[PDB]
Each structure stands twice: as C-alpha cells, then as structure tokens.
Symmetry: C3
Subunit: 244 residues, 3 copies
C-alpha cells in the first residue's frame, strides 16, 4: 500500500526523485546542491549553497523558461571588459578524493562572438581571466583544456557548436585531481569528451570557484553570453561527527 497523509506505506517514484535532489544542510558522507534559475535575480548572490556572482555590471536578463528548460538566466555583456557571471562553489570543500561531479544545462547565444569565454570547471573568480580548467568555450568552439597564468598548458581538440542550442556538460574530478569533461546534446547523447593529462587548476581559497562562468573579454555591451538553465554539484565528503 502507498503511503498516505494519515497512514504509512511505500514511497512513490516522484517522492524518491524529490529526495534525490535535496540540498545538503548537515553533511554525513554525501554532498548535493543544485539551482534551476527560476528566482528573481536582482541582488541574488547565492541559492542552495551555490554562489551566484556578478562582476563588471554584467547584464542579467529576465528569467524565462523554454520547453523543458524551467527557469533560464540569459546573460549579456556590459561596457566593462571581463564582466562575468559565475555559478559555483569553493574548491577547498571538494578535495580530489571527493570526486566532485558538476553538471550544467546551458544554451549557446543566438550569435557567437570572439569576445565570448565560458568555462565549465575551475576558474579565477570575478574579473579574473588568467586561470581555468574544464570545458572551455571560446566563440563557437568548445574544447577541454587548462589555462594557467594566461598560458594554454594543455588543449584538447575542438568541437564546433551551434548558436541557440541547448547542451549538457559534465565535469568530473578524478582522484589524482585530473579531470574529465563530457559535452552532450539536449537529449543526453555524447558529443565530445576530454580527459586531462595534468591536474586541474586549483586554488583552495576565494580567488577561485568551481562551476559555470561566462564572460565577455571586451568592453562592448549587448553581446549575448551563454544562458544557464540548471547546475548540479555532487561529491563524496567526510562529515561524520559525534552525535550528542
């Protein structure tokens, strides 16, 4: 018998799913956080553990939904160079043994522009542009890579993207601090993957974050950046504490 408001019973698939996406408050061994970008975004600097960071007067457009993409944050450049939006978390809490997995549902802009730089992975925070590691998107080209002190230390082959298209990217932290990134179509079909040779860019302080960052490299406004529907964080953690 199925559980009721007055009498106990079994748990439905819908209740199981709900529980699977519950944001961690007090941790034991698993960490989960996700945000679906449905909230009014004026002055919104975090949600469900995730930092939502605007710099350089980046233009967060009106929230919309399209098709199955519920809550979408479109992003437009400003007159300040390096303006960015970052949805991410601190690296200090996800050491290599946590095997953090980050999943991002994102839409390419309606026109590519050489000024567009997006990363799914680790990155310098804010207006910074010197360090990143994961799936990098410059203009219409996606590729796995590492950038350190503004130098490309490692670069995979490129996958050319289409404008106004929904994509999924999974970033996977490996136990030696290397990473694997996988790009999928909106139906989950694998399109591209890259596994790093060297360890990811890491800073275990607030100069860096891990997640999604989209940025305009020039000081011209009105350039569309990458829109975000959904981000998910999952990791294994050590959080066994004495109960009193």
């Amino acid at each position: 018998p199925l559980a009721t408001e007055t009498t106990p019973g079994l748990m439905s698939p819908s209740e199981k799913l709900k529980l699977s996406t519950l944001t961690t408050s007090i941790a034991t061994s698993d960490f989960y956080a996700s945000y679906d970008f449905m909230m009014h975004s004026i002055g919104l600097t975090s949600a469900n553990n995730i930092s939502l960071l605007s710099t350089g007067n980046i233009s967060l457009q009106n929230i919309l939904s399209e098709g199955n993409h519920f809550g979408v944050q479109p992003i437009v450049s400003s007159t300040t160079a390096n303006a960015s939006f970052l949805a991410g978390m601190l690296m200090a809490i996800f050491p290599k043994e946590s095997e953090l997995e980050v999943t991002v549902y994102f839409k390419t802009p309606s026109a590519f522009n050489p000024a567009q730089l997006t990363v799914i992975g680790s990155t310098s925070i804010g207006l910074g542009i010197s360090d990143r590691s994961g799936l990098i998107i410059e203009n219409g080209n996606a590729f796995g890579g590492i950038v350190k002190a503004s130098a490309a230390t490692e670069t995979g082959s490129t996958y050319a993207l289409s404008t106004s298209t929904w994509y999924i990217c999974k970033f996977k932290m490996l136990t030696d601090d290397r990473f694997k990134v996988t790009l999928y179509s909106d139906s989950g079909t694998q399109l591209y993957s890259y596994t790093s040779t060297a360890a990811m860019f890491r800073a275990d302080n607030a100069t860096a974050h891990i997640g999604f960052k989209t940025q305009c490299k020039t000081a011209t406004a009105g350039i569309s950046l990458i829109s975000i529907d959904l981000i998910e964080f999952k990791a294994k953690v050590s959080a066994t504490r004495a109960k009193v």
Copy 2:
C-alpha cells in the same frame, strides 16, 4: 538502519519541500520566521522592500508562527512584496497562491494590498486578484491605472486573520477566495477577462501591501505564510 515504510509525517515533509530541480511540479513556501534585515529572498520567493518600508519585528501569534508586520514610511507607494516572477508560471502551470494575513487595528484609504499579479515595488498601475482598499476586499483587474473589471466588495474585520487562495486558470483568468482563519469561504470572485500578466521583472505574483501616501506610521497588512503550488513540464536528459 533498515529499509522500511514511509511515515505520514515524512510524506508530509516531502509534500512541502521547496523545489530545487523541477520535474513535474513546483512548490515554494515561506513562513516569515527569519531575521529580516537585508533579507531579499527565501525558499525561491522574492521579499522586496521599496520606498523605505518599515518591516517591524518578527512575532508569533497563536498558531500563526512567524509573522511580518509592515508599516508605512514617508515615501509614497512604499511597499513590501512577497512573490515570484510570472514568466515561470504560464497559464498551463495552473498556479495556486495561498496567503495567511492579518488586517491592521485600523483601516486607512491609503492601504492597498493585492493577492495576485501586480506592478513591482513603487508601481501602482497594474494588478489582478484579491484587491484590498481600506477595509474592502474585492476581486478585480486594474490595468494602466484604470479598473477594467471589479467584483462586489466584502467588508473585512480589523485585527483579523484571513486566508486567501489565488488560482490561475488554464486560460489565464483567475479565481480568488477569501476564507476566515477557521477555513470557511467568506468571499469568492472568478474573473471574466484574463489577469494582468507581465513576464518580466516589472511585475510579480504573490502578496503585496502598499501605502499610497507619504504618511509614516500607517500599519499595513501583516503576513504569516505564503505558498506557491504549480504544474511544470521540466523533463531534461539525465547524464
């Protein structure tokens, strides 16, 4: 430590879980128990102060756990809004908003409260749902500062707890129902035309109480609890 049945309280907990990743439905609620200095949102819901509105100390009262009293400032059109964006709630979503609220000790012609859609912040040009002007609750639609539809009025009791349910219909018409704190229907209104809707940040749907005048000290409508319940089509590929 052993897998078993799900408790009725556990299922009740899950039933009011604030949506993180949407699949089939949306839910959000806020019970106003948090320290309110610099609090601009909770549980997906916007908590918007404008015109230097005076948010009084949080209190509880009987079974009304967590109550936000609100008082006017010296800025005309000052308001507090607890709400969400309409763009995420199209007519198919069939959105339902429930508000537990308390009328002030004294009514005032400067008080304007809306449960439904409304101009954001200092705006007064557009609203649809249950409109409270002075002591009078009525269903209605206002667009560009003019009434387009107005139901009969209901005289509310001062210092009294009410419940309002706003229902979005699948054709974007609405129905509003006012209950007493006992849960018995006191007043209802079903709209003829479609509600006021703006699918951008110039509007919100939820609860808004406002002072139309620049006189401070006027108590507006206090809020205990707001609830958002909707249907969503949000199936994305798992990877």
Copy 3:
C-alpha cells in the same frame, strides 16, 4: 520508476530537512561550506558580521566539513553571529541548539564567545548559556552589563574541537553541556534564573564569537556546524 521501500539514506536526509512551512516541529542547520562574501543567512539562520570582523577562508578539517575561522578587527566588540530570533522560540518550544566549534591556537582575554542567547552585533550587555572568556568555559547569565549568575569555570585546550548543546527549559531556564569532539560530556550547567530573552532584533540565540578590544589579528572561535531543533505551535487551517 516503481513504488517501494524508503532507504536508511533517504530517511536520514529527510530527518534533517530545513523547515519551510511549519506544523509541529522546527529544524534548521548550517555547515559553513558556502562562499561567505555577502552571505547574511542560510537555511533560516542569520549569519551576521559586525565591526568589520575578518572571516577567513572556508576550509574543512578531518570530519569537520565546512569550517568558518574568524579573526578580530580594529573595532572593539566586532563579532560573528550564527543564530535566530528568540520570538520564534518561546519557552514552550524547548529549543535545543547544538554547536560544533574549535578553539583558537592561542587564548586571549579579549575573546568572548556565547552559545545561547545574546545581544546582537556590537552589543555586549546581555548573554546567557555557555560563555567562553579567554580559555575558560562556564554556564552563566549576564544582564544589563552585569553578571547575575555564574557557574564554575572549565579550562579549555587550544586548537581543540568541542561540542555544546544548549537546552531551553519550559520555565525559560537553560541547561548547557560541553562535550569533547568524540562526544564525552566534560561540563554542564543548569541555570537557577531564567535566560536572557529579548523577543526583538536586538538579540539572537545561537553562536556568537566576539573580540572585546580594538586590536586586529586575534583569532576567535571557529564554527563547523550549528543545529536548531524545537517544537512549534503552527497548526493552521488548510485551503
């Protein structure tokens, strides 16, 4: 895809779900893993910085996942407070607060930490619960800038993880218990008089660490985790 049993893992997650819409219970916890810039609340809990207090980088240590270290500024009475309003925990709620915290590498007479009720922010006039001054923990009450009641002191060790449980009694008295990181009880105090209570925004209940002097660079007490559990009167009419 098919209905069935609930796992122990699922049962555990639901047990520590942060209360949204209340019925008979309240729970909130925060584990200090978030980027702290501009962060003033999380999971119902106020996270308050005053006097330009220096929040260090979030770290984790052993099984202490998400830790917020805290350092003094040039403002006397600069503090960090993780807590909630007292109006929402009347004496009948029997609130229980649990704090996991680490002492600094060096004690200093300027260090003042409270688990329990306290003046907010730069305030230092009122507190009750487990008070830590310099290297000494003790149960006690201070009101209007004067001790009213003071338990025996217990000498803490530097760079050491501790747990404190604060328990609200039905007559508004309190019991505090101090534990080792493995959960061995080390100290307890049960008050004779009622706790410090102010049911407004001049006070909070939870954790507060403060530097009494205008000298920067003095480490205060780090916090890993805070929990709030209580009974609530929130049975209201449905629909």
